[PDB]
Amino acid sequence: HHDITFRNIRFRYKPDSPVILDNINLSIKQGEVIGIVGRSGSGKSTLTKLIQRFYIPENGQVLIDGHDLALADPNWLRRQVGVVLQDNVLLNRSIIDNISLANPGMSVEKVIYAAKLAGAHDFISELREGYNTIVGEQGAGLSGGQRQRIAIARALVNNPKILIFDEATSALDYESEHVIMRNMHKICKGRTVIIIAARLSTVKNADRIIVMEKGKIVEQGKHKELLSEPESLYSYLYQLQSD
Ligand SMILES: Nc1ncnc2c1ncn2[C@@H]1O[C@H](COP(=O)(O)OP(=O)(O)O)[C@@H](O)[C@H]1O
Numbered sequence: 161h162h163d164i165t166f167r168n169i170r171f172r173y174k175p176d177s178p179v180i181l182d183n184i185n186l187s188i189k190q191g192e193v194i195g196i197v198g199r200s201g202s203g204k205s206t207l208t209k210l211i212q213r214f215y216i217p218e219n220g221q222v223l224i225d226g227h228d229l230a231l232a233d234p235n236w237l238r239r240q241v242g243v244v245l246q247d248n249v250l251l252n253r254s255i256i257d258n259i260s261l262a263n264p265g266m267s268v269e270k271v272i273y274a275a276k277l278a279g280a281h282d283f284i285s286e287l288r289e290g291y292n293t294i295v296g297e298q299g300a301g302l303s304g305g306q307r308q309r310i311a312i313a314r315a316l317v318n319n320p321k322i323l324i325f326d327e328a329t330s331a332l333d334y335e336s337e338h339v340i341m342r343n344m345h346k347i348c349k350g351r352t353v354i355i356i357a358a359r360l361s362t363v364k365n366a367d368r369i370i371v372m373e374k375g376k377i378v379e380q381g382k383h384k385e386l387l388s389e390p391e392s393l394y395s396y397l398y399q400l401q402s403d
Pocket residue numbers: 173180198199200201202203204205206207
């Protein structure tokens with residue numbers, strides 16, 4: 161079964177604005193973990209915005225879980241997709257409030273489950289005020305890597321069938337990165353996952369990597385196969401980011 165399909169998608173942000181996505185064709189199997197790489201401004205984040213129907217394409221269709229999103233219930237769509245946001249944990253609010261910031265009636269049990277997958281439960285549990293800890297500075301002083309694991313738990317709490325990782329805007333501490341990489345298979349288990357990767361190394365082990373350039377998918381495949389394509393943009397990017 162395919163959880164996500166783009167057919168002939170053309171998109172621009174405003175009536176006269178430049179075309180940002182052109183003739184995008186992609187079909188992602190249920191449970192696939194996809195990495196999307198490409199230079200800044202290639203259209204990676206825009207592709208994810210369309211999955212959520214934040215914007216409507218001028219040509220083509222997006223189909224989610226088989227449903228054309230034009231026809232799909234927007235409430236159902238919002239429940240199908242969890243997004244790991246960057247730098248979006250609310251400082252003036254508690255950890256649990258941050259994690260359940262979609263369904264405030266969210267069971268403590270559901271919150272802790274999502275926190276365990278995210279690898280946040282352990283550090284939260286060792287805080288004086290636990291889940292009731294106010295995230296904010298002088299209110300506790302959590303790190304960016306701790307906050308990022310909180311952001312993962314938030315994304316996971318409603319058990320989304322599709323999980324999207326927005327591009328990383330900062331480096332996290334070794335501890336937090338280690339916990340996340342160790343827990344990734346648990347976080348992704350049973351879900352279709354899209355990771356927008358600043359560094360190609362991040363998605364070396366994805367089922368498939370999609371390479372975007374100037375709003376088109378130029379290359380797609382497994383890491384080893386993309387490196388086998390003689391003059392591939394993938395290899396070029398791989399070389400550029402290499403030590
Ligand atoms: N909200 C927006 N309004 C107008 N243009 C946008 C908006 N968001 C992104 N863009 C433009 O769309 C292009 C693709 O951006 P984006 O999808 O964010 O690329 P990437 O994620 O690969 O860095 C860029 O030229 C960007 O400036």
